[PDB]
Amino acid sequence: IQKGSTVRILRKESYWYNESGTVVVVDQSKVRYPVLVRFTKVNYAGTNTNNFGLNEVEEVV
Amino acid sequence: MKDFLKYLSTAPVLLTAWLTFTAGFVIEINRFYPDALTFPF
């Protein structure tokens, strides 16, 4: 995955679970949740972006 | 008349116009053929 890639959220406790988002940036450092994904639908708190782990996102073909 | 027509395209104005038209043709059907309990055919 990279910037601009489309991924499916696999985190169950997510307002965008099973949904598709756009990767903003994948951090190359040793952070726990490097993948930053932007969504079109705001969550219940109003935010439309979140940091996800490498195993919590699945790239769409 | 470019933004006025866009204002008329807003949800409230369009809903009011559509519901006014809808109530209008319903009321006029019930005026011209009143007391219709069953299908006319």
Binding site: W16 | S9, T10, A11
Partner: protein
């Protein structure tokens, strides 16, 4: 006949109801003068009451012991104009409404600002979609066949 009911054309209580309503309207008519608009309105009321009662009598309508038309909605085509034909009419109209709404939602859902086009309707596109709903039974059973009617697993689910 069906359910112990009898046709309203032979229901004495139905004619009693008609006679009582007409008598009340005429008694009301007595307290006004000449061809004044109140008398014209009451006379129109009497005429409409008589026409409605006559139409209900000659309508294959079954009346109970209260002299009121009862609806036979078990499904028989004999009393098909009471429920079945209005049912078909409503199903057509409501399917039209739902189809045009869904088509508009899916059409402006692929534009740059989908949310803007929901409070400020694209009246040209809206008119284009709305008059295309007359084929909603055919369009629905042409999009379901192609798998374009139902989502599969992109739909979101709660934690459990």
């Amino acid at each position: 006949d069906i359910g112990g009911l009898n046709p309203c054309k032979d229901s004495e209580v139905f004619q009693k109801r008609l006679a009582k309503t007409v008598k009340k309207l005429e008694n009301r008519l007595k307290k006004y003068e000449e061809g004044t608009p109140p008398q014209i309105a009451i006379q129109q009321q009497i005429t409409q009451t008589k026409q409605r009662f006559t139409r209900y009598a000659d309508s294959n309508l079954l009346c109970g012991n209260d002299g009121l038309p009862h609806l036979i909605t078990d499904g028989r085509w004999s009393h098909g104009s009471e429920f079945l034909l209005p049912s078909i009419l409503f199903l057509y109209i409501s399917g039209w409404i739902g189809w045009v709404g869904r088509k508009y939602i899916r059409t402006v859902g692929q534009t740059s600002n989908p949310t803007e086009k929901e409070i400020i309707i694209d009246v040209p596109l809206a008119i284009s979609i709305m008059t295309s709903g007359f084929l909603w039974p055919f369009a629905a059973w042409q999009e379901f066949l192609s798998g374009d009617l139902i989502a599969s697993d992109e739909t979101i689910t709660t934690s459990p």
